[PDB]
Design a protein around this nucleic acid. Structure first.
Length: 115
RNA sequence: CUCUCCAAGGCUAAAUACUAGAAAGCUACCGAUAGAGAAGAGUACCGUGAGGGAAAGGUGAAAAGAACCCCGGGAGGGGAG
């Protein structure tokens, strides 16, 4: 399905997919300007990560299609998958130890020329 | 009774038992949770000490390891090779 000419992919980003998915929901299908404004405004780590990926995707589309400006582009699809995990130890009382997982996420954004 | 042997001195190879190992091989033996604990090891780590004791193999036929350009602080990705 993907026009892989027009897309950006960010692998192993430092956030959990459970925390990045809602921000993706708020910009799926929006216009590029509106999405960029939302991601700049909202003060979430996932918001910043999506901002970088979305800007890169728009940049790729513009570079390969010179007659496409910032205001004919809309964020067609947005996917947020889960990535590698790292386990570190959190020690507790009575010699008990717990393992403390750190999750990463993959982010895939494709933009497309507006309707 | 008869029959056998000559102690209170000392020696003796081979047939026998064994392979940590060195050389050459065989396998209705294993093919990475298997096979030695260990394909990288008595290492990491644990205990004052004696001692206990892991996990982790695979690009391609050849690095020919991505010149260069673009987004990005990088990472990562999109082209070109």
């Amino acid at each position: 399905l993907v026009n892989r000419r027009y897309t950006a992919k960010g692998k192993n980003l430092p956030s959990s997919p459970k925390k990045v998915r809602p921000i993706a929901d708020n910009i799926r299908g929006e216009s590029y300007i509106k999405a960029i404004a939302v991601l700049c405004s909202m003060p979430n780590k996932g918001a910043k990560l999506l901002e970088k990926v979305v800007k890169s995707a728009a940049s790729n589309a513009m570079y390969h299609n010179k007659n496409l400006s910032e205001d004919m582009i809309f964020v067609k699809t947005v996917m947020v998958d889960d990535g590698r995990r790292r386990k570190k130890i959190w020690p507790r009382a009575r010699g008990r130890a717990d393992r403390l997982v750190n999750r990463n996420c993959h982010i895939f954004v494709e933009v497309d020329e507006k309707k």
